[PDB]
Amino acid sequence: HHWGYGKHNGPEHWHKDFPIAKGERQSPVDIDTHTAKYDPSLKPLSVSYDQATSLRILNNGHAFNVEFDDSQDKAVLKGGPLDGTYRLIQFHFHWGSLDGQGSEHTVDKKKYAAELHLVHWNTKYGDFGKAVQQPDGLAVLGIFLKVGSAKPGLQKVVDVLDSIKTKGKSADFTNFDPRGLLPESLDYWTYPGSLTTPPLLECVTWIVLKEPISVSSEQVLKFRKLNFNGEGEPEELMVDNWRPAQPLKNRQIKASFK
Ligand SMILES: Cc1cccc(C(=O)NN)c1
Ligand SMILES: [Zn+2]
Numbered sequence: 373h374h375w376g377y378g379k380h381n382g383p384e385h386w387h388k389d390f391p392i393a394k395g396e397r398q399s400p401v402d403i404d405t406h407t408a409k410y411d412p413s414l415k416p417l418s419v420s421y422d423q424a425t426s427l428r429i430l431n432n433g434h435a436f437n438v439e440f441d442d443s444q445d446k447a448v449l450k451g452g453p454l455d456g457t458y459r460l461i462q463f464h465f466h467w468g469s470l471d472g473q474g475s476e477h478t479v480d481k482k483k484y485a486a487e488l489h490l491v492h493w494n495t496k497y498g499d500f501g502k503a504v505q506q507p508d509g510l511a512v513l514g515i516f517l518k519v520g521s522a523k524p525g526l527q528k529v530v531d532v533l534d535s536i537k538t539k540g541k542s543a544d545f546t547n548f549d550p551r552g553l554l555p556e557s558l559d560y561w562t563y564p565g566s567l568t569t570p571p572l573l574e575c576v577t578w579i580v581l582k583e584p585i586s587v588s589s590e591q592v593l594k595f596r597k598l599n600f601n602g603e604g605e606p607e608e609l610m611v612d613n614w615r616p617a618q619p620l621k622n623r624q625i626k627a628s629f630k
Contacts (some may be wrong), residue, residue: 375570376434376600378608383615390570397574398618399565400476403625408561410630417558417579417628418451419513419551424460426548429532433539433600434569434613435464438529438548442493442500447550449492449511452579452628453562458492458511461500463550465489466568467595469611471519474592476568476614477580479516484584485592486517487614488553489568507564509575515553515585522588525552530594539602555583559629568615582629 375381375389387393424447428439439462440447447460467486468474475484490513493503503509517523528548535543559582566574598610 377613386570390572392572396621397564397566399568400617401620402478402617403561405480408625408627411626414628415451421447421551426545428542429545430542431536431539437462437464454511457495459495460492463490466614475516478617484516485519488515504573504575511577514580517587518584519589520586523585530591533594538599555585557583561625561627563623563625
Protein backbone atom coordinates (compact mmCIF):
# COMPACT_ATOMS: atom_id res chain seq x y z
CA HIS A 373 0.00 0.00 0.00
CA HIS A 374 1.20 3.50 -0.92
CA TRP A 375 -0.55 6.75 -1.64
CA GLY A 376 -1.34 7.45 -5.25
CA TYR A 377 -4.14 8.42 -7.58
CA GLY A 378 -5.88 5.08 -8.22
CA LYS A 379 -9.20 3.83 -6.88
CA HIS A 380 -7.67 2.17 -3.82
CA ASN A 381 -5.00 4.73 -2.90
CA GLY A 382 -6.27 8.03 -4.35
CA PRO A 383 -7.08 11.35 -2.70
CA GLU A 384 -10.14 10.11 -0.79
CA HIS A 385 -7.86 7.62 1.06
CA TRP A 386 -4.97 9.94 1.95
CA HIS A 387 -6.42 11.03 5.29
CA LYS A 388 -5.81 7.55 6.75
CA ASP A 389 -2.04 7.96 6.52
CA PHE A 390 -1.97 11.82 6.55
CA PRO A 391 -4.73 13.10 8.83
CA ILE A 392 -4.01 16.72 7.87
CA ALA A 393 -5.77 15.88 4.59
CA LYS A 394 -8.92 17.01 6.48
CA GLY A 395 -7.21 20.12 7.90
CA GLU A 396 -8.16 23.77 7.81
CA ARG A 397 -5.73 24.99 5.13
CA GLN A 398 -5.80 22.31 2.45
CA SER A 399 -5.15 22.74 -1.27
CA PRO A 400 -6.20 22.90 -4.00
CA VAL A 401 -9.38 25.01 -3.86
CA ASP A 402 -11.93 26.32 -6.31
CA ILE A 403 -11.22 29.99 -7.07
CA ASP A 404 -14.63 31.65 -7.12
CA THR A 405 -13.88 34.81 -9.09
CA HIS A 406 -16.95 36.55 -7.68
CA THR A 407 -15.83 35.98 -4.07
CA ALA A 408 -12.13 36.79 -4.44
CA LYS A 409 -11.44 40.39 -3.56
CA TYR A 410 -9.06 42.80 -5.25
CA ASP A 411 -6.40 43.87 -2.74
CA PRO A 412 -4.65 47.14 -3.68
CA SER A 413 -1.92 46.49 -1.11
CA LEU A 414 -0.69 43.46 -3.08
CA LYS A 415 2.51 44.16 -4.97
CA PRO A 416 3.45 43.02 -8.47
CA LEU A 417 4.99 39.58 -8.52
CA SER A 418 8.77 39.70 -8.94
CA VAL A 419 10.06 36.63 -10.82
CA SER A 420 13.88 36.61 -10.96
CA TYR A 421 14.84 33.50 -12.91
CA ASP A 422 17.72 34.92 -15.00
CA GLN A 423 20.36 32.86 -13.14
CA ALA A 424 18.26 29.70 -12.72
CA THR A 425 20.34 26.50 -12.72
CA SER A 426 18.30 23.40 -13.55
CA LEU A 427 20.00 20.10 -12.73
CA ARG A 428 17.90 17.02 -13.33
CA ILE A 429 14.45 15.71 -14.21
CA LEU A 430 13.02 12.88 -12.09
CA ASN A 431 10.02 10.58 -12.46
CA ASN A 432 9.05 10.21 -8.79
CA GLY A 433 6.11 7.85 -9.35
CA HIS A 434 3.45 10.55 -9.16
CA ALA A 435 4.75 13.34 -11.45
CA PHE A 436 8.07 14.43 -12.94
CA ASN A 437 10.10 17.08 -11.12
CA VAL A 438 12.57 19.40 -12.78
CA GLU A 439 15.05 20.17 -9.99
CA PHE A 440 17.13 23.33 -9.52
CA ASP A 441 20.26 24.33 -7.64
CA ASP A 442 18.89 26.16 -4.59
CA SER A 443 22.20 26.70 -2.76
CA GLN A 444 22.13 30.42 -3.69
CA ASP A 445 19.55 33.07 -4.66
CA LYS A 446 19.78 32.11 -8.35
CA ALA A 447 16.06 31.82 -9.12
CA VAL A 448 13.79 33.59 -6.66
CA LEU A 449 10.24 34.82 -6.21
CA LYS A 450 9.70 38.10 -4.34
CA GLY A 451 6.92 40.62 -4.02
CA GLY A 452 3.30 39.82 -4.66
CA PRO A 453 1.86 38.77 -1.31
CA LEU A 454 5.25 37.62 -0.02
CA ASP A 455 7.57 39.00 2.58
CA GLY A 456 11.17 38.18 1.80
CA THR A 457 12.79 35.90 -0.73
CA TYR A 458 11.71 32.45 -1.88
CA ARG A 459 14.14 30.19 -3.80
CA LEU A 460 13.04 27.90 -6.64
CA ILE A 461 13.73 24.22 -5.84
CA GLN A 462 11.64 22.29 -8.40
CA PHE A 463 8.68 22.43 -10.73
CA HIS A 464 6.23 19.74 -11.83
CA PHE A 465 2.82 19.37 -13.45
CA HIS A 466 -0.55 17.77 -12.80
CA TRP A 467 -2.57 16.61 -15.78
CA GLY A 468 -5.53 14.54 -16.89
CA SER A 469 -6.35 11.55 -19.01
CA LEU A 470 -8.47 13.91 -21.14
CA ASP A 471 -8.19 17.62 -21.97
CA GLY A 472 -11.28 18.42 -19.84
CA GLN A 473 -9.53 17.68 -16.54
CA GLY A 474 -6.09 17.76 -15.03
CA SER A 475 -5.74 20.95 -13.04
CA GLU A 476 -5.87 20.97 -9.24
CA HIS A 477 -7.14 24.49 -8.74
CA THR A 478 -10.32 25.31 -10.63
CA VAL A 479 -11.68 28.72 -11.64
CA ASP A 480 -15.46 29.05 -11.21
CA LYS A 481 -15.41 25.20 -11.23
CA LYS A 482 -13.58 25.18 -14.59
CA LYS A 483 -10.91 22.48 -14.86
CA TYR A 484 -7.91 23.08 -17.11
CA ALA A 485 -6.01 20.38 -18.97
CA ALA A 486 -3.02 20.65 -16.63
CA GLU A 487 -1.41 22.81 -13.98
CA LEU A 488 2.24 23.75 -13.45
CA HIS A 489 3.61 24.18 -9.91
CA LEU A 490 6.87 26.06 -9.35
CA VAL A 491 7.86 25.34 -5.75
CA HIS A 492 9.89 27.88 -3.75
CA TRP A 493 11.06 27.97 -0.14
CA ASN A 494 11.53 30.95 2.19
CA THR A 495 15.25 31.62 2.60
CA LYS A 496 14.87 32.87 6.16
CA TYR A 497 14.48 29.20 7.16
CA GLY A 498 17.78 28.11 5.60
CA ASP A 499 16.66 24.98 3.74
CA PHE A 500 13.56 23.34 2.33
CA GLY A 501 13.23 20.80 5.17
CA LYS A 502 13.03 23.54 7.79
CA ALA A 503 10.76 25.65 5.60
CA VAL A 504 8.10 22.90 5.55
CA GLN A 505 7.83 23.24 9.32
CA GLN A 506 6.58 26.82 9.02
CA PRO A 507 3.25 28.42 8.08
CA ASP A 508 5.04 30.80 5.66
CA GLY A 509 7.66 28.31 4.56
CA LEU A 510 6.77 27.90 0.89
CA ALA A 511 5.43 29.83 -2.07
CA VAL A 512 4.08 27.89 -5.04
CA LEU A 513 3.39 29.63 -8.33
CA GLY A 514 0.57 27.79 -10.08
CA ILE A 515 0.01 28.20 -13.82
CA PHE A 516 -2.90 26.70 -15.74
CA LEU A 517 -2.39 24.91 -19.06
CA LYS A 518 -5.02 24.84 -21.81
CA VAL A 519 -4.73 22.92 -25.07
CA GLY A 520 -4.20 25.14 -28.11
CA SER A 521 -0.98 26.26 -29.77
CA ALA A 522 2.29 24.69 -28.66
CA LYS A 523 4.42 26.21 -25.89
CA PRO A 524 7.97 26.46 -27.31
CA GLY A 525 9.62 26.70 -23.91
CA LEU A 526 7.98 23.42 -22.85
CA GLN A 527 9.33 21.35 -25.71
CA LYS A 528 12.69 20.51 -24.11
CA VAL A 529 10.75 19.00 -21.18
CA VAL A 530 8.48 17.04 -23.52
CA ASP A 531 11.43 15.66 -25.45
CA VAL A 532 13.23 14.18 -22.44
CA LEU A 533 10.20 12.32 -21.04
CA ASP A 534 11.00 9.17 -23.06
CA SER A 535 14.16 8.82 -20.96
CA ILE A 536 12.33 8.90 -17.60
CA LYS A 537 9.33 6.72 -18.44
CA THR A 538 9.09 4.86 -15.13
CA LYS A 539 9.24 5.62 -11.42
CA GLY A 540 12.78 6.25 -10.13
CA LYS A 541 14.31 7.15 -13.50
CA SER A 542 16.11 10.45 -13.81
CA ALA A 543 18.04 12.33 -16.49
CA ASP A 544 20.45 15.23 -16.57
CA PHE A 545 18.46 18.36 -17.41
CA THR A 546 20.71 21.41 -17.34
CA ASN A 547 20.25 24.90 -18.76
CA PHE A 548 16.46 24.81 -18.78
CA ASP A 549 14.94 28.27 -18.53
CA PRO A 550 11.64 28.27 -16.56
CA ARG A 551 10.80 31.75 -17.93
CA GLY A 552 9.64 29.94 -21.07
CA LEU A 553 6.72 28.48 -19.10
CA LEU A 554 5.21 31.81 -18.02
CA PRO A 555 2.19 33.50 -19.60
CA GLU A 556 2.26 37.14 -20.68
CA SER A 557 0.54 38.54 -17.57
CA LEU A 558 1.61 38.02 -13.97
CA ASP A 559 -1.77 38.99 -12.47
CA TYR A 560 -2.67 36.44 -9.81
CA TRP A 561 -4.93 35.13 -7.05
CA THR A 562 -3.41 34.25 -3.70
CA TYR A 563 -4.50 32.31 -0.61
CA PRO A 564 -2.88 30.27 2.19
CA GLY A 565 -2.84 26.52 1.56
CA SER A 566 -0.86 23.29 1.54
CA LEU A 567 1.07 20.79 -0.48
CA THR A 568 -1.41 19.01 -2.73
CA THR A 569 0.50 15.72 -2.33
CA PRO A 570 1.23 13.85 0.90
CA PRO A 571 2.46 14.85 3.37
CA LEU A 572 -0.03 17.68 2.57
CA LEU A 573 1.79 20.10 4.89
CA GLU A 574 0.09 23.46 5.42
CA CYS A 575 3.07 25.68 4.57
CA VAL A 576 2.21 27.25 1.22
CA THR A 577 1.42 30.77 0.07
CA TRP A 578 -0.31 29.93 -3.20
CA ILE A 579 0.06 32.37 -6.08
CA VAL A 580 -2.11 31.23 -9.00
CA LEU A 581 -1.77 33.15 -12.26
CA LYS A 582 -4.96 34.35 -13.91
CA GLU A 583 -3.70 33.80 -17.47
CA PRO A 584 -3.22 30.18 -18.63
CA ILE A 585 -0.48 29.14 -20.98
CA SER A 586 -1.32 27.31 -24.20
CA VAL A 587 0.30 23.93 -24.91
CA SER A 588 -0.37 21.71 -27.88
CA SER A 589 -2.34 18.48 -27.83
CA GLU A 590 0.85 16.59 -28.75
CA GLN A 591 2.74 18.11 -25.82
CA VAL A 592 0.21 17.00 -23.23
CA LEU A 593 -0.21 13.65 -25.00
CA LYS A 594 3.45 13.02 -24.25
CA PHE A 595 2.87 13.70 -20.53
CA ARG A 596 0.27 10.91 -20.62
CA LYS A 597 2.83 8.36 -21.89
CA LEU A 598 4.75 8.45 -18.62
CA ASN A 599 4.20 5.62 -16.14
CA PHE A 600 3.39 5.65 -12.41
CA ASN A 601 5.04 2.23 -12.05
CA GLY A 602 8.69 1.28 -11.98
CA GLU A 603 10.44 -0.56 -14.78
CA GLY A 604 9.50 -4.22 -14.96
CA GLU A 605 6.17 -3.67 -13.21
CA PRO A 606 2.71 -3.66 -14.83
CA GLU A 607 2.27 -0.50 -16.89
CA GLU A 608 0.03 2.15 -15.35
CA LEU A 609 -0.15 5.37 -17.34
CA MET A 610 0.69 8.53 -15.39
CA VAL A 611 -2.61 10.34 -15.89
CA ASP A 612 -5.07 12.08 -13.59
CA ASN A 613 -2.42 12.85 -10.97
CA TRP A 614 -4.46 15.73 -9.53
CA ARG A 615 -6.13 16.21 -6.18
CA PRO A 616 -9.67 17.68 -6.41
CA ALA A 617 -10.72 20.95 -4.83
CA GLN A 618 -10.88 20.97 -1.00
CA PRO A 619 -13.06 23.06 1.36
CA LEU A 620 -12.03 26.70 1.55
CA LYS A 621 -13.11 26.90 5.21
CA ASN A 622 -11.95 30.11 6.92
CA ARG A 623 -9.79 31.47 4.09
CA GLN A 624 -9.91 34.44 1.73
CA ILE A 625 -8.64 34.42 -1.85
CA LYS A 626 -7.24 37.80 -2.87
CA ALA A 627 -6.79 39.10 -6.42
CA SER A 628 -3.92 41.30 -7.62
CA PHE A 629 -6.17 42.75 -10.34
CA LYS A 630 -9.67 44.12 -10.87
C1 LIG B 1 7.07 19.05 -2.14
C2 LIG B 1 6.00 20.05 -2.53
C3 LIG B 1 6.01 21.33 -2.01
C4 LIG B 1 5.04 22.25 -2.37
C5 LIG B 1 4.05 21.90 -3.27
C6 LIG B 1 4.03 20.62 -3.81
C7 LIG B 1 3.02 20.29 -4.86
O1 LIG B 1 2.59 21.15 -5.62
N1 LIG B 1 2.63 19.02 -4.93
N2 LIG B 1 1.77 18.58 -5.96
C8 LIG B 1 5.00 19.70 -3.43
ZN1 LIG C 1 1.87 20.14 -7.47
